[PDB]
């Protein structure tokens, strides 16, 4: 039950690729949570609609994301999808995006951040960043695995369909298991 | 003994959080130092800073490069130093005027003095902080937790010790004690 | 709320540096905890700890492994934590009984409490200290500079906050403030 | 192929845990490889020395020649404890197995690891991923062996060791490298 | 044999600094390689030499993965900032993205290092890369041991040789040289 | 001027590895310095070391601790420095008399001088070498590739330059050039 919970939802990467996450905002709000959308960019139909579904303007600036620390604290922050670029910057404590600042404002309070990974270098250079996050207080992952062991050997991507189950567990300070899965047979 | 030194003064983050350093520029100059302002953003308080110091603020990465070969600083100060810029500094990125200024200073084996201020200092930013603490020619204004219940992972320098810190750094020494109870110095 | 908890207690470094923790052992038992000592080395200091506590000290890596599946700790304490052991713990090495016990505890997602003592805390050991601070289920007894002039990079825990530290740890919390002016409690 | 290849085989951790990598060791030799055992330190050692025709390298000094004088074609380490995996990623050499692997990387030759640690998704995650990304290092496919009882634990599928070696000899990582280990217990 | 290979060529840093690699782009084409310019931002001339548009956006760089795979991605010069970003797996420029899209496929990236903090804070980054799969360096060293003690810069004149060896999965040796004697 | 300076000299790795550094104790002593030997293990080429200088070689971690508060060094030399010891030193481990002596030296803010020698300097040990290069009070005897084709990842110090290195390190300076074509000085 995330009824009564304030849940942040950040988007990173490419405008169009956010099709799959829509039903998830739908489910969250349907299940009783208040959702605050955060976007890493200041027309956009995708976002045009996101503000419709839930009853809040998209936080789209770093300064707009700051109040999530002291003024409007989240019970959980979600980032999906989480690009390789943003994962790297998050693991390093950078905050040059509204979505990262929202993450940081959330960890500020010792509250959970839920990540849905999606990067073609997860088993290359981004591997260390991934595992640093996995090991960090208050950070949880949507179960993930390789999505294309032949076509993209270093690629790992989350099972989005498990996002809600992951949030529910993170709200209890727990990582949903199994967190490492053969993603490639749920394509 | 800041007297005659060429001192860079960079600042990162929100603008309004800067009146804590406005009087510091004034201190440094009253002390005889030559102060070169560096702004990580390309706002009139800037022309005020520029009148105080007698130099146009450096406000581009290219305007900062000459701080290396042409006009070398005796010390580079960054204050406040945000978590974002601290992480970038620790990783040797230079995508801002202030970071490039700091780099052009370490290029010459010269001191860089940092005043930390981030709410993730004892979270993900901790390793960045300590990497810098351990690094040649980098010094910290003494710092600590400013709000252990409200912001448990937060650490912030005692700005008032800024001048004392750069005085020690010009001699290549870290001002001690460097780790302090910052929350005991919130109302000066 | 130490009552009915199984508490691991590990010692690292020279043996001569333990009189300052013995009393803390007895406070834990008085509070109703079952304490399992483990020593990083196979006098009375050993016989005593075993007398006080109700158990033979675990003194081998094989001896510590069952802290995982058979006798799981509710919390594992390491005081003092030498700089050597801190660095190895942070790097996930287990070449001592204490390190292995600590691993066996994190295995179960249970809290490990550390009381740092090293003269390079602000030097090369700093990153290791801060990696741990950031890590799931690891807690520090509040610590700070013990001798800022004579030992500039040195930091040491306030041993007297040990029990309070484990109490918060048992709830998944870091005792605050965790960074203190250790040199005033000398 | 494996035929003719000189394959070092390093064991780390408790001697008991070794009776599950014997058949794979036996498989390598049935395939034409010479298997040169090296041990971090008995009855079990003799069986391994008897199966392969070679006395195990058991000292740091006996492992050094593996660089300049008698280089292998591939070095396998199985099982790889969390302790040894950490030291390996950090370039320590205080055991025959670790020295042997360093002497193999010395020459740009492949090192194949079969991981086995209850902290792979804890503190040791960084180390595993450092190795994953490093030149000439390969992993036998691995994953969680017990998601609820040992949430941070990961362990290789030993049955894929020969296929991992085969790919490593071609400078390739056998794919997929991330598997649901717990579905093959 | 650059013969028939598709070689990506990314540039980072200041605009004017490029006079050094421009004849190299020429050597590559004369060796029979198809060269795709990538810019983190003279340009025209390169597009004239190369016959290809400069990829100048991150989205323009993504196709280098699935559709137009490179056989080699070259970055020269490689600034300290870009090297750090690259080592940390960031992709906030066309060039970094091109590099990622190349390592995506297990293909070589060749780096020509140029930074005054190489023996400073960037040192760890440089060594992370040196040890990483599919990354090769044109040999480099201190260009000015007294004037810029922490500085290291590649020997550009060795770029082609580096690219040749990388195609074979090899690092050109010696990779550590006294740059200052060829300055 | 090594005259009047107390300088620690630690040895790591194989035993026979010291047909090289014998003249160095000699040169240092001749230069008017007090040399304190420390040995990573507690054929008496070592009896001569304790002979050349008038001190028993520190051979235990405990014998090394006093190098901190009681008999501080002006400089600690480690030559040669194996890849194992280099990694341990970079990671702040102290499980040898030589590592403990170096830690007791950095304790006081004093220079440590390192003569690298490892076949994985350009492999996994690269990151450790560079962490050290960048750290306060750590200096290197100039080093480079000793055999680019034979051992592509190997780097080794120019031992001939050891004294000039300590002399600079005493003044808080790193001797330049620090990166050299070592393969040219093999004769």
* Assigned CATH for F1-187: 3.40.50.1950
Q: Which chain E residue's Cα is nearest to B135?
A: E121
Contact list in D for residue F151 (CB cut-off 8 A) is 67, 106
Contact list in A for residue C112 (CB cut-off 8 A) is none
Q: Which of F135, F136, F158, F137 is nearest to F146 (CA)?
A: F158
Report the alpha-carbon distance of residue E106 to residue B45 in Å, rounded.
Answer: 52
Q: Among residues 2-21 of chain D, which lie with CB inside 8 Å of chain E?
A: none
Q: Which chain B residue's Cα is nearest to A137?
A: B123
Contact list in B for residue F178 (CB cut-off 8 A) is none
Q: β-strand A113-119 against A76-82: which pairing, if any? A: parallel
Q: C172 — contact with chain A (CB < 8 Å)?
A: yes
In which element (H, E) is residue C168 found?
A: helix C162-169
Dump the DSSP string for C64-125: HGGGTTTS--SEEEEEEEEHHHHHHHHTT---SHHHHHHHHHHTTT--EEEEEEETTTTTTT
The answer to whether residues C68 and C109 touch, using CB atoms and an 8 Å cutoff, is no
Instruction: Note the maximum CA span of chain E.
Output: 47
Q: Which of A14, A6, A70 is nearest to A32 (CA)?
A: A6
Query: Angle, to 10 degrees, between the axis of helix B97-106 and the axis of helix B83-90?
Result: 40
In which element (H, E) is residue B155 found?
A: strand B155-157
Contact list in A for residue D180 (CB cut-off 8 A) is 178, 180-182
Instruction: Note the maximum CA span of chain A.
Output: 47
Contact list in A for residue B153 (CB cut-off 8 A) is 107-108, 110
Please list the residues that pair with E154 across neighbouring strands. E140
Q: β-strand D111-117 against D137-139: which pairing, if any? A: parallel
Measure in Å the smallest separation between the Cα of E129 and chain F Cα atoms: 10
Tokens standing for residue E77: 């010069």
Measure in Å the smallest separation between the Cα of F78 and chain E Cα atoms: 20
Contact list in D for residue F124 (CB cut-off 8 A) is 88-91, 105, 130, 134
Report the alpha-carbon distance of residue A116 to residue C86 in Å, rounded.
Answer: 32
Contact list in A for residue E65 (CB cut-off 8 A) is 120
Contact list in B for residue E117 (CB cut-off 8 A) is 92, 103, 106-107
Select from D83, D86, D119 the Cβ nearest to the Cβ of C106. Answer: D119
Q: Which region, left, alpha or beta, applies to residue B55 given φ > 0 means left and ψ of -120 to 50 means alpha?
A: beta
Tokens 């870091």 belong to C174
Instruction: Note the maximum CA span of chain F.
Output: 47
Q: C50 — contact with chain F (CB < 8 Å)?
A: no
- Chains in touch with E (≥3 Cβ pairs < 8 A): A, B, D, F
Select from A83, A88, A152 the Cβ nearest to the Cβ of E104. Answer: A152
Q: Which region, left, alpha or beta, applies to residue A181 given φ > 0 means left and ψ of -120 to 50 means alpha?
A: beta
Q: How many Cα atoms occupy the beta-carbon half-sphere of A115 within 13 Å?
A: 32
- Chains in touch with F (≥3 Cβ pairs < 8 A): B, C, D, E
Q: Which chain A residue's Cα is nearest to C130?
A: A136
The answer to whether residues B17 and B80 touch, using CB atoms and an 8 Å cutoff, is yes
Q: Mark yes or no for CB contact F84/D105 under 8 Å.
A: no
- Choose from E139, E176, E180 for mutation: most chain F CBs within 10 A: E176
Whether there are 3 or more C-beta pairs closer than 8 Å between B and D is no
Query: Residue F45's CB: how many other CB atoms inside 10 A?
Result: 12
Cα D70 from chain centroid (whole Å): 19
Measure in Å the smallest separation between the Cα of A124 and chain D Cα atoms: 5
Contact list in E for residue F130 (CB cut-off 8 A) is 119, 123-124, 126-127
Domain ranges (residues) in chain C:
1-185
The answer to whether residues E76 and E40 touch, using CB atoms and an 8 Å cutoff, is no
Q: β-strand E6-11 against E72-78: which pairing, if any? A: parallel
Query: Angle, to 10 degrees, between the axis of helix A22-30 and the axis of helix A45-53?
Result: 10
Tokens standing for residue B173: 């020494």
Breaks after residues in chain D, judged by C–N over 2.5 Å: 41
Rounded-to-5 percentages of helix, strand, coil across chain D: 40, 20, 40
Residues near C85 by Cβ (< 8 Å), separated by ≥ 6? C12, C13, C40, C78, C96, C98, C99
Q: Does domain D1-184 have CATH number 3.30.930.10?
A: no
Query: Residue E88's CB: how many other CB atoms inside 10 A?
Result: 22
Q: Which of C181, C179, C13 is nearest to C83 (CA)?
A: C13
Please list the residues that pair with C34 across neighbouring strands. C6
Q: Mark yes or no for CB contact F125/D89 under 8 Å.
A: no
Report the alpha-carbon distance of residue A122 to residue D176 in Å, rounded.
Answer: 13
Rounded-to-5 percentages of helix, strand, coil across chain E: 40, 20, 40
Residues near C155 by Cβ (< 8 Å), separated by ≥ 6? B179, C116, C117, C118, C121, C122, C129, C143, C144, C145, C146, C182
Q: Which of F22, F90, F101, F93 is nearest to F60 (CA)?
A: F101
Report the alpha-carbon distance of residue C3 to residue B141 in Å, rounded.
Answer: 44
- Chains in touch with B (≥3 Cβ pairs < 8 A): A, C, E, F
Q: Mark yes or no for CB contact A92/E88 under 8 Å.
A: yes
Instruction: Show the DSSP H helices in chain E as ranges.
Output: 22-30, 43-50, 58-61, 80-87, 94-103, 123-131, 159-167
Q: B176 — contact with chain F (CB < 8 Å)?
A: no
Tokens standing for residue A159: 């099972």
Select from B124, B145, B178 the Cβ nearest to the Cβ of C177. Answer: B145
Q: What is the CA radius of gyration of chain A?
A: 15
**CB-neighbour burial class of residue C54 (10 A; exposed 0-12, middle 13-18, buried 19+):** exposed
Measure in Å the smallest separation between the Cα of D113 and chain A Cα atoms: 15
Report the alpha-carbon distance of residue F23 to residue F30 in Å, rounded.
Answer: 10
**CB-neighbour burial class of residue A174 (10 A; exposed 0-12, middle 13-18, buried 19+):** middle
The answer to whether residues B97 and B67 touch, using CB atoms and an 8 Å cutoff, is no
| Distance from the first to the final alpha carbon of chain C | 29
The answer to whether residues B83 and B118 touch, using CB atoms and an 8 Å cutoff, is yes
Q: What is the DSSP letter of F21?
A: S
* Assigned CATH for E1-182: 3.40.50.1950
- b/e per residue A112-130 (b: at least 16 CB within 10 A): bbbbbbbbbbbbbbbbbbb
Report the alpha-carbon distance of residue C101 to residue F168 in Å, rounded.
Answer: 45
- Deposited resolution, Å: 2.3
Q: Mark yes or no for CB contact F149/E173 under 8 Å.
A: yes
Tokens standing for residue D37: 């055992």
Residues near A19 by Cβ (< 8 Å), separated by ≥ 6? none
Q: A97 — contact with chain E (CB < 8 Å)?
A: no
Q: Mark yes or no for CB contact A149/D180 under 8 Å.
A: no
Count of positions (residues) in chain F: 187
Domain B1-188, CATH homologous superfamily name and number: Flavin prenyltransferase-like (3.40.50.1950)
Q: B107 — contact with chain F (CB < 8 Å)?
A: no
Task: Identify the experimental approach.
Answer: X-ray
Q: Which of E147, E151, E142 is nearest to E183 (CA)?
A: E142
Please list the residues that pair with D51 across neighbouring strands. none
Which SS3 state, helix, strand or coil, does residue C157 take?
A: strand
- Choose from D91, D106, D135, D169 for mutation: most chain E CBs within 10 A: D135
In which element (H, E) is residue D164 found?
A: helix D161-169
Q: A124 — contact with chain E (CB < 8 Å)?
A: yes
Report the alpha-carbon distance of residue D122 to residue C107 in Å, rounded.
Answer: 8
Tokens standing for residue B80: 């406040």
In which element (H, E) is residue D128 found?
A: helix D125-133
Q: Mark yes or no for CB contact C92/D122 under 8 Å.
A: yes
Which SS3 state, helix, strand or coil, does residue C158 take?
A: coil
Report the alpha-carbon distance of residue A122 to residue A116 in Å, rounded.
Answer: 12
Select from F128, F152, F154 the Cβ nearest to the Cβ of D91. Answer: F128
Q: Which of A85, A156, A152 is nearest to E65 (CA)?
A: A152
Residues near F4 by Cβ (< 8 Å), separated by ≥ 6? F32, F33
Measure in Å the smallest separation between the Cα of D133 and chain E Cα atoms: 6
Tokens standing for residue C136: 């799931």
The answer to whether residues B50 and B37 touch, using CB atoms and an 8 Å cutoff, is yes
Kindly report the three-state secondary structure assignment for every residue of A28-89.
HHHCCCEEEEEECCCCCHHHHHHHHHCCCCCECCHHHHHHHCCCCCCCEEEEEEECHHHHHH
Measure in Å the smallest separation between the Cα of B33 and chain F Cα atoms: 25
Report the alpha-carbon distance of residue E18 to residue C46 in Å, rounded.
Answer: 70
Measure in Å the smallest separation between the Cα of B119 and chain E Cα atoms: 23
Tokens standing for residue E86: 């690259």
Q: B135 — contact with chain E (CB < 8 Å)?
A: yes
Domain A1-186, CATH homologous superfamily name and number: Flavin prenyltransferase-like (3.40.50.1950)
Q: Which region, left, alpha or beta, applies to residue F13 given φ > 0 means left and ψ of -120 to 50 means alpha?
A: left
Q: E149 — contact with chain B (CB < 8 Å)?
A: yes
Q: A126 — contact with chain E (CB < 8 Å)?
A: yes
Report the alpha-carbon distance of residue C163 to residue B102 in Å, rounded.
Answer: 44
Measure in Å the smallest separation between the Cα of B82 and chain A Cα atoms: 10
Report the alpha-carbon distance of residue E28 to residue E6 in Å, rounded.
Answer: 10
Pick the CATH number of C1-185 from 3.40.109.10, 1.20.58.1910, 3.40.50.1950, 3.40.630.30: 3.40.50.1950
- Choose from C92, C95, C110, C138 for mutation: most chain D CBs within 10 A: C92
Dihedral sign from CA coordinates of C83, C94, D128, F127: positive
Q: Which of C101, C35, C39, C41 is nearest to C67 (CA)?
A: C101
Q: Mark yes or no for CB contact E89/A88 under 8 Å.
A: yes
Tokens standing for residue F46: 């070592």
């Amino acid at each position: 039950s995330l009824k009564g919970k304030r849940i942040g939802f950040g988007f990173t990467g490419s405008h169009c690729t956010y099709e799959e996450v829509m039903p998830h905002l739908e489910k969250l709000i349907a299940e009783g949570a208040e959702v605050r959308p955060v976007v890493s960019y200041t027309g956009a139909e995708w976002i045009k609609k996101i503000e419709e579904i839930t009853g809040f303007k998209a936080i789209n600036s770093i300064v707009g994301a700051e109040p999530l620390g002291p003024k409007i604290p989240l019970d959980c922050m979600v980032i999906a999808p989480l690009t390789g670029n943003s994962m790297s910057k998050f693991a390093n404590a950078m905050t040059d995006s509204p979505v990262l600042m929202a993450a940081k404002a959330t960890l500020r309070n010792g509250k959970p951040v839920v990540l849905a990974v999606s990067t073609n270098d997860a088993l290359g250079l981004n591997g260390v960043n991934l595992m640093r996050l996995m090991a960090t207080k208050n950070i949880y992952f949507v179960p993930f695995g390789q999505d294309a062991p032949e076509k993209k050997p270093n690629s790992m991507v989350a099972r989005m369909e498990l996002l809600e189950d992951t949030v529910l567990e993170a709200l209890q300070g727990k990582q949903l298991q199994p967190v490492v899965v053969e993603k490639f047979r749920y394509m």
